[model samples]
Target: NLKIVRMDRTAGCVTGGEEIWLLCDKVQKDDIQIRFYEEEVWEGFGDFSPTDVHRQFAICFKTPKYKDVNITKPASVFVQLRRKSDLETSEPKPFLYYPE
Candidate 1:
């Protein structure tokens, strides 16, 4: 069986950008991709594609700043693991984002 077991930080409000380390089980391939999808409120924040150099059983990617806003606020996002070969997607996981 395969699954994402944990994140370095499941949820939070950040004063600055942060990195997330995704921990998974049964993920032994190098042809996978990590996709980060910001919630609708963060319209300008594009998906973060984590590269192979940053992956294995664990992967890391930096969060993007909220767009067009100068005030601190709360946000959320979900992640998915996909196969680069055929675009098959895995289960989605939730994440939180808040900037100060």
Candidate 2:
């Protein structure tokens, strides 16, 4: 089972592109994706290369930009580990996006 241990930060700017260090269980670099989404609303993927997957236990990725960039308040979203091939997702974690 894929599981997220923890992340370096739980918040970032709404404009995104923040680098995050996430520790997780074993995963295939080519088959894993960092997914961020709001309840049936918007979604985005983290940017990273296979080289950024550190020995299957961690990943260093840049956060994706939120759907709206002009919001004045912080927005909460869900973050999770997604398997590209199987579309299986882990338990979601909360992430906050502050106004830029």
Candidate 3:
């Protein structure tokens, strides 16, 4: 029953560690994981503590470093919310990682 509403931005540096403000449906702060991935090739997670899950409706997290930081062009990926226990994922949102 998870759903993503919106994000303040959809692009960040490939080196990661960029803050993103995401709005979503009600979520369990302790059981949610913010995932960034490119199909089966690579995956990364956003950095956030339970306290960063704002009132269970939003998340303030830093982007994870890309698998290969030396990429020359912007890489497109998907961002979605995953349940830690059930591994259920929400509809993915498009995000871009640019060369740093």
Candidate 4:
């Protein structure tokens, strides 16, 4: 069996603008893939991308800030890659990425 783990940034809750460490153990050659959920994937407050150093079992995600305001309030909510090959067959975990 395979397992997908998510590491938090600040308070162990999935907050916005924070980074997430995705760990896949006992992974299959093609059992793991990443994709963004929800329609708000492009409204990030900052730039986001996977780092080259983490090419094997680790995937990092950066949360974008809310678009409706400029008050600098952290989102306390985040996105995830999930653990399935297809969107219809996958289960997702939403996180909170708090400020640094």
Candidate 5:
């Protein structure tokens, strides 16, 4: 898949009319799956468009759907970046950095 606009992991908007990409590591991807919620329901898991790398994903829908949507919640965006395999229920261990 072609690379779109790249932004920080905590980016707010995808800027309508333009494609975008979000970067995430394997651990971050698991973290997103383990803890996140969607503001609106998707038609189906098929609605999610993800690339070879789970880090990048895209969702195309009408404008009205996003109107007045609040992304104040930190996990909002991550939750939206979906894949059909999310039906699984497995909690991942917390990310830990050590050996400073």
Candidate 6:
């Protein structure tokens, strides 16, 4: 199973966004795409966007800022990797996003 061992930052807020570097255990060349969600209740992580720098062991990206909803505090989100063709997703990790 693909796993992320570490993240540069544990959390971030929406005002300026946050930079996070992921240290993954198993990753492919360009077959993996990152996706984040507010939780299982939300619709397939509609608010989060994937990053472009996907490597075998490291992936980096800045948390996206949401403009559509009114956020007052930090909320929970999950991050995971998915294979494009099969839609196979890796383990989902928890991430906290603070709205500004």
Candidate 6 similarity to native, TM-score: 0.72
Model 3 C-alpha lDDT per residue in residues 4-92, reported as the tens digit of each score: 89999999999999999999999999999999999756899999999999999999999999988999999999999999999999999
lDDT of 1 by residue, 1-100 (tens): 4456777876644443566667776454555666556655332222334453243576665555544335456666776776667767668788666666
Give the per-residue Cα lDDT of candidate 6 at 8.
78
> Where's the lowest-lDDT run of ten residues in candidate 1?
41-50
Q: List TM-scores for all candidates, in order.
A: 0.60, 0.97, 0.97, 0.41, 0.26, 0.72
Ranked by lDDT from best down, the candidates are: 2, 3, 6, 1, 4, 5
- Pairs with steric clashes in candidate 1: 14-98
Q: Top TM-score: which candidate number?
A: 2
Which parts of model 3 are misplaced by more than 4 Å?
none
lDDT tens digits by residue: candidate 4, 57-78: 6655554544434334444443
Candidate 2, position 9, lDDT: 97
RMSD of each: 4.3, 0.7, 0.8, 5.9, 11.8, 3.7
In order, candidate lDDTs are: 0.57, 0.95, 0.95, 0.42, 0.28, 0.64
Ranking by TM-score: 2, 3, 6, 1, 4, 5
User: Tens digits of per-residue lDDT for model 2 on 1-100?
Assistant: 9888999999999898999999999999999999999996799999999999999999999999999999999999999999999999989999999998
Off by over 4 Å in 2: none
C-alpha lDDT (0 to 100) for residue 27 of candidate 4: 40
- TM-score-wise, the better of 5 and 6 is 6
lDDT of 4: 0.42
**Span of ten consecutive residues with least summed lDDT in model 4:** 44-53
